[PDB]
Enzyme design. Sequence first.
Site, PDB file in Angstrom:
ATOM      1  N   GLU A 290       6.516  11.819   0.868  1.00  0.00           N
ATOM      2  CA  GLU A 290       7.587  11.807   1.869  1.00  0.00           C
ATOM      3  C   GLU A 290       8.990  11.773   1.305  1.00  0.00           C
ATOM      4  O   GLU A 290       9.907  12.420   1.844  1.00  0.00           O
ATOM      5  CB  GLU A 290       7.341  10.645   2.866  1.00  0.00           C
ATOM      6  CG  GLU A 290       6.144  10.904   3.819  1.00  0.00           C
ATOM      7  CD  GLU A 290       4.780  10.680   3.173  1.00  0.00           C
ATOM      8  OE1 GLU A 290       3.766  11.096   3.779  1.00  0.00           O
ATOM      9  OE2 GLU A 290       4.722  10.072   2.078  1.00  0.00           O
TER      10      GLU A 290
ATOM     11  N   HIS B 211      -0.176   3.848  12.796  1.00  0.00           N
ATOM     12  CA  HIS B 211      -0.263   5.084  13.571  1.00  0.00           C
ATOM     13  C   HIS B 211       0.399   4.832  14.936  1.00  0.00           C
ATOM     14  O   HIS B 211       0.210   5.619  15.900  1.00  0.00           O
ATOM     15  CB  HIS B 211      -1.715   5.483  13.817  1.00  0.00           C
ATOM     16  CG  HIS B 211      -2.330   6.266  12.703  1.00  0.00           C
ATOM     17  ND1 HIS B 211      -3.515   6.963  12.851  1.00  0.00           N
ATOM     18  CD2 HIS B 211      -1.915   6.485  11.437  1.00  0.00           C
ATOM     19  CE1 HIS B 211      -3.797   7.578  11.714  1.00  0.00           C
ATOM     20  NE2 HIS B 211      -2.841   7.299  10.840  1.00  0.00           N
TER      21      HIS B 211
HETATM   22  C1  LIG Z   1       2.396   7.714   3.111  1.00  0.00           C
HETATM   23  C2  LIG Z   1       1.314   8.414   3.916  1.00  0.00           C
HETATM   24  N1  LIG Z   1       1.536   9.713   4.227  1.00  0.00           N
HETATM   25  C3  LIG Z   1       0.632  10.410   4.940  1.00  0.00           C
HETATM   26  C4  LIG Z   1      -0.571   9.831   5.390  1.00  0.00           C
HETATM   27  C5  LIG Z   1      -1.617  10.599   6.203  1.00  0.00           C
HETATM   28  N2  LIG Z   1      -2.831  10.840   5.405  1.00  0.00           N
HETATM   29  C6  LIG Z   1      -3.949   9.994   5.484  1.00  0.00           C
HETATM   30  S1  LIG Z   1      -5.184  10.557   4.383  1.00  0.00           S
HETATM   31  C7  LIG Z   1      -4.181  11.906   3.853  1.00  0.00           C
HETATM   32  C8  LIG Z   1      -4.816  12.790   2.793  1.00  0.00           C
HETATM   33  C9  LIG Z   1      -4.988  12.001   1.444  1.00  0.00           C
HETATM   34  O1  LIG Z   1      -5.689  12.851   0.519  1.00  0.00           O
HETATM   35  P1  LIG Z   1      -6.273  12.238  -0.794  1.00  0.00           P
HETATM   36  O2  LIG Z   1      -5.351  11.265  -1.386  1.00  0.00           O
HETATM   37  O3  LIG Z   1      -6.575  13.372  -1.744  1.00  0.00           O
HETATM   38  O4  LIG Z   1      -7.633  11.517  -0.395  1.00  0.00           O
HETATM   39  P2  LIG Z   1      -8.981  12.078   0.287  1.00  0.00           P
HETATM   40  O5  LIG Z   1      -8.758  11.928   1.740  1.00  0.00           O
HETATM   41  O6  LIG Z   1      -9.216  13.484  -0.120  1.00  0.00           O
HETATM   42  O7  LIG Z   1     -10.090  11.128  -0.212  1.00  0.00           O
HETATM   43  C10 LIG Z   1      -2.961  11.978   4.448  1.00  0.00           C
HETATM   44  C11 LIG Z   1      -1.863  13.028   4.216  1.00  0.00           C
HETATM   45  C12 LIG Z   1      -0.728   8.442   5.007  1.00  0.00           C
HETATM   46  N3  LIG Z   1      -1.837   7.727   5.354  1.00  0.00           N
HETATM   47  N4  LIG Z   1       0.191   7.747   4.289  1.00  0.00           N
END
Ligand SMILES: Cc1ncc(C[n+]2csc(CCOP(=O)(O)OP(=O)(O)O)c2C)c(N)n1
Lengths: 386, 386, 336, 336
Positions: D70, D140
């Site tokens: 972000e 959320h």
């Molecule tokens: C600071 C923040 N930004 C955005 C989100 C929304 N979000 C939740 S999971 C996710 C994907 C994370 O991907 P990764 O770290 O590769 O883990 P995976 O889900 O593939 O295990 C996002 C963008 C969040 N929880 N926190």
Amino acid sequence: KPQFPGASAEFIDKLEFIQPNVISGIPIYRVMDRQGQIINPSEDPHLPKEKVLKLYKSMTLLNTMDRILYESQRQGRISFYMTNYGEEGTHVGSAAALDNTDLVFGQYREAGVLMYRDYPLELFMAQCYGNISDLGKGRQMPVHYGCKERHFVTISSPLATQIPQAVGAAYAAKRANANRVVICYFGEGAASEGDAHAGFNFAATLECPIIFFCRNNGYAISTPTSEQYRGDGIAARGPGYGIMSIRVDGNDVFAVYNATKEARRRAVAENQPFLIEAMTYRIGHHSDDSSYRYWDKQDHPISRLRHYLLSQGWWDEEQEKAWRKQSRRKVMEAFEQAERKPKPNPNLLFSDVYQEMPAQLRKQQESLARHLQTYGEHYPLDHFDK
Amino acid sequence: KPQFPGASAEFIDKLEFIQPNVISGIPIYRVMDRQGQIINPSEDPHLPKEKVLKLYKSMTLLNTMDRILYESQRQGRISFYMTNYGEEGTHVGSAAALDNTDLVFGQYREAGVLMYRDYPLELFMAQCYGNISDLGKGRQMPVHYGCKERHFVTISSPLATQIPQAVGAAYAAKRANANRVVICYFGEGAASEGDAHAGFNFAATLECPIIFFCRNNGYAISTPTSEQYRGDGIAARGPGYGIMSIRVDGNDVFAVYNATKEARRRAVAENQPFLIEAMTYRIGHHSDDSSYRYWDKQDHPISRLRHYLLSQGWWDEEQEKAWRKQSRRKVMEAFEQAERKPKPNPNLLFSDVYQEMPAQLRKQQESLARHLQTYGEHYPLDHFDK
Amino acid sequence: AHFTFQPEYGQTQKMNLFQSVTSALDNSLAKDPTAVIFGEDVAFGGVFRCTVGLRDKYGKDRVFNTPLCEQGIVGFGIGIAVTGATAIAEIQFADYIFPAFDQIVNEAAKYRYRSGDLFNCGSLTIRSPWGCVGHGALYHSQSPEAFFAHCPGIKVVIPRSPFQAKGLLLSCIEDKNPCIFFEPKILYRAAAEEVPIEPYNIPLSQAEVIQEGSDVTLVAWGTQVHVIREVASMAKEKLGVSCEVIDLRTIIPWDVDTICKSVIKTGRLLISHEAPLTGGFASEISSTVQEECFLNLEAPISRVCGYDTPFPHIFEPFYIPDKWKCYDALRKMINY
Amino acid sequence: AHFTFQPEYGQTQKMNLFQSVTSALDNSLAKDPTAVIFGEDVAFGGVFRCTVGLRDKYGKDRVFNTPLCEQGIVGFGIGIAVTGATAIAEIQFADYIFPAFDQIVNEAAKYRYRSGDLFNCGSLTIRSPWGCVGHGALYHSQSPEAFFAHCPGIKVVIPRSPFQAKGLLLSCIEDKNPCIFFEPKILYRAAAEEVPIEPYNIPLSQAEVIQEGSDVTLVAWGTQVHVIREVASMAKEKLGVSCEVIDLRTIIPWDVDTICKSVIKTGRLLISHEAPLTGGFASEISSTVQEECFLNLEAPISRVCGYDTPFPHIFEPFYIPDKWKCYDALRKMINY
Ligand SMILES: Cc1ncc(C[n+]2csc(CCOP(=O)(O)OP(=O)(O)O)c2C)c(N)n1
Ligand SMILES: Cc1ncc(C[n+]2csc(CCOP(=O)(O)OP(=O)(O)O)c2C)c(N)n1
Ligand SMILES: [K+]
Ligand SMILES: [K+]
Ligand SMILES: [K+]
Ligand SMILES: [K+]
Ligand SMILES: [Mn+2]
Ligand SMILES: [Mn+2]
């Protein structure tokens, strides 16, 4: 064969941790020695005499201004100042390799870039004094320079914030297809900020024509690099982001120039970022009594460039004397004029917060006007415009 | 010889940019093939039968719970859920290599670590249902597990925030000299956050006994890794911070176990961080209709471990059938019990904001009590405790 | 400058504000073996000298420098506190606290609540220079307290003098909740006062009536307390107005009772702070006071604050809510 | 749920809130060749479907995904805007806007001021889902508007319906100041309404009186507007009270005149918002109204807000300032 989408690699059947190569890090690119001699002919950029003299004069004029403004601060004439001692070559050398319209983002030690771009002494002074001639309208602390005409984005105090911004400007330039690059300067301390990780990664994944220029002078205020990071400096971080990287001798204007010229050429053609880490030494104080801690009598960018000029028959003692006299005169003329100008109209404290001025903000401005009508004798009204 | 404090290196006299090695990245460490066969005898950890059966049963029990809770969400019985499909081996394999008291920080895909540490099915369910048995008092969204007794720090939604925190906990452990390590799990998407750069750098400069465990499954919701980074995955970033790093086959519980065991041993002895990047594939949806996009019938952690068991004569079809029946029974018993428990007392919405309860917060709590006395029929009072 | 500083626990010694911070930190590391102090440039004593001599006295493993990364400094501090060790983090200027805003607001403040108290970072304290300094401009002058006041779970505390600073800082360090302690930097070297050598505590969430009055209540915190103390003097001399002067001290949770009790008696209120008017903490005090003392308010509550602009360099003398601005608003309010 | 949605420019089409956002974005990229949209997962259409079909229609270089960062998304957006190109950044949930707080507050908001207008990022807009959703819990569900309200230099705008959302979002995109547009996510799919297919603008810093009344003024924004609209109905039916219902729409700079003019007529004010009471934006409205309408206020202004705690999962029904809570406070205020 490994089928994972996250990486391209072979399987290995033996447990082996990857060790960092820090004792023998990325080598330091050098073009001329401390005696100003070209070490490897194939690397000589053979810059024309007029341009090399401009590199020299720009960096000595900057040094003359530094001495004077530093003293001015000591006397409390200006509230703050940061010198460029030991950083003169990294700035003029890289600025000379850019096109005039390439956009520059940086911070505190890039004044030489503006100097090379012929920023007027009068404007450097107006900003430090916050007087009426300051296009920044006296709002920021001294040395927070900015010039729209010379494509030098206004400096801000929060470290590293300009890094992901420079990347966005580069993405927009890519789209406008103007064959322009963006260069972004920052120190090795600022590189520890999260925004540096943000900018480096975005520049690679979004394929941006940008040059990241890290000035590594071994300290961030009182912190030595041993407490700043443990990898092989900043250059070694570039490949991990998929960024073409190089380390250069920052006290060598030609090494800096060659690396920047080549980075600009490839960045604009390939829409890919390049990282240049220039090794230098902060000779002057941070801003702060430096004496938490050789490079002035044995390895100084100005001194090396001067020896180079002599070996070509391009400079001599009399020219040195006359130039030191002329630059001192030029700087003192701007300085005295700057000190005598009044400060801007106090009303300028209210404009540009938003483009337009919100009605509620105008009411605060009217509030002040009324206040001054009655209590004006308790304010320095005679020092400010109108 | 270069004299710069920022790096240790030789001079180089030719201009050469350092190119990233991404097409041929850090190799993927593997111990057994997809048929569960030990590839290199010298790498076999020869884990005892009871422990390997526990690895197997933990990950199939997790899979059974996943199926059931996933369906529960689909029906709106719980408000949210995230599965562990394809991540089962990275979690049980690494958890088995840790000491019971090593502190774990992670996020959404580490339930298997808790399962291996014998977290009760009843507590996994209580948190997802936010009922009276939830020690988290029903305050967080489902799968935001935490257990003080099993040294598993409460998960929070903001990605990567636990990374520099895990580093601080490791620094404190170093000082307490308790011969404990901290492990911190995160995905390849979360590694793009500025907090990851913060934690990795602090762990190296402050010499902390921590294992960074990155699960790289090729996607962060809908984003493929090609839009997440351009270097050689996350493993290649470790050396740039001076961090000992390795990449392993995440669908191989033994490769994961060996890498984690060795990282823990050296991290605790040397007070230095280690980075393990486990290559895997997110088989299930992110939480989201995955179908922005093989690993279930050709390369699944559970399947490979099962073949290994068979080759040792440690498992068979009847044992497989009985276990699938018993685990389903165990999970359904916890599930039904969880659904029937009431939710906690509404007053718990006010405690733990601060350790003590500020007087002004108590007044808000009294305000609610009064409100409910009069308008209670418009609230689900019968579903909540007292 | 724009203010004038003026003003039981054993032996005391004259100390300016920065020395009183060092004294509080020294007392803390002496009595708490787990306590550590860290941040940018704290090892050599700090850019404002608040940690001078502490590394030599307590060890490099307890007073040390971190990489230049505010989000890391706070996340790192939270982690130390999660193990129960006392973590005293320094953010070099309050203006640079924003990179750590997510770690403060989404993490530190919610750590205990969201875990059902299974985990916490109560032993974390973040200290940082704060407030105008005459020429600090946009990034060496900010007063960020109102941004943090909207975040349940953290305490925000601001002292007005060396004696108050050491007592409030020891209470922050010992409080079982994450605390942000803002040190008015213009006071670091401005006038010393007697400060006990040994540790003592001043309670959090307690305002201090430093001068009783019956005509109007004046509330402020930090350096601004000295401004309203002088305004009280000007009102008494030029208008025969008796002013009740109150130092709020703790921004959140704030001492609502003390302020209301005072306003119930005087019937008038003027709140002042360097931070911008809009969304400033004075709006919360004013709202609350209006709700609790509607019957006693004889005139609209006034807020004399910095303007709704970034903090300027050369225009600072015209930006701050000085004694004349507070005086004038007080005059008009008294004449209401 | 806890609310009920109900309610010149050419052809219109029924659109729910997320579709109206897509329509506003589509109109923007069609008429502004420099505009680009970016953020996490926006390429395939977004986790709330606000960008569906835009990448196919305008190109991968104009609608694209960024790494998960972000602070980078906002710094990157500022940079695009610095060149004059329109940058429309998405922050996935308002709860995750904090990592970018420094880039928003220290950089975007101060960009024009600090440069004397030599540079600016006026063409930047940051849009992000906002507000409770029934089970969003701590991360959320947040309503961060009051944190941003204390920052001069940015505009914060929140719509209450599909028609309002498209018009306010086009105004944000076209406004020459960095704007944060909060989209109430509980409304993304909740009840559609007629929305012009072509672009139209709704002015910023202008509140909308959606129902005239003479006994009391009710102010809210986002989904909460629907709650007070219903409260107005309950008051009229159960108490014979005439309620003037106002949607603030723009948090800063806010429409002070409309609110004061309304309160001068009714003499009573109740402000409501999902965000926590302390430091919430209602305290700023209340303070200001008290200062401008002291003579017309017949009772203390009331604030019906979320409690001073993080946003809970299972307790949400007991946390939100629902119609019954607003009604009760209105009843007591009317009986004052
Ligand atoms: C600071 C923040 N930004 C955005 C989100 C929304 N979000 C939740 S999971 C996710 C994907 C994370 O991907 P990764 O770290 O590769 O883990 P995976 O889900 O593939 O295990 C996002 C963008 C969040 N929880 N926190
Ligand atoms: C976010 C932020 N944190 C802290 C500071 C205070 N500060 C100003 S310069 C500085 C040192 C920066 O060192 P470096 O980046 O290496 O540059 P150098 O001064 O050596 O050229 C620090 C900590 C700041 N300006 N911004
Ligand atoms: K900057
Ligand atoms: K987290
Ligand atoms: K504390
Ligand atoms: K805009
Ligand atoms: Mn440096
Ligand atoms: Mn992933």
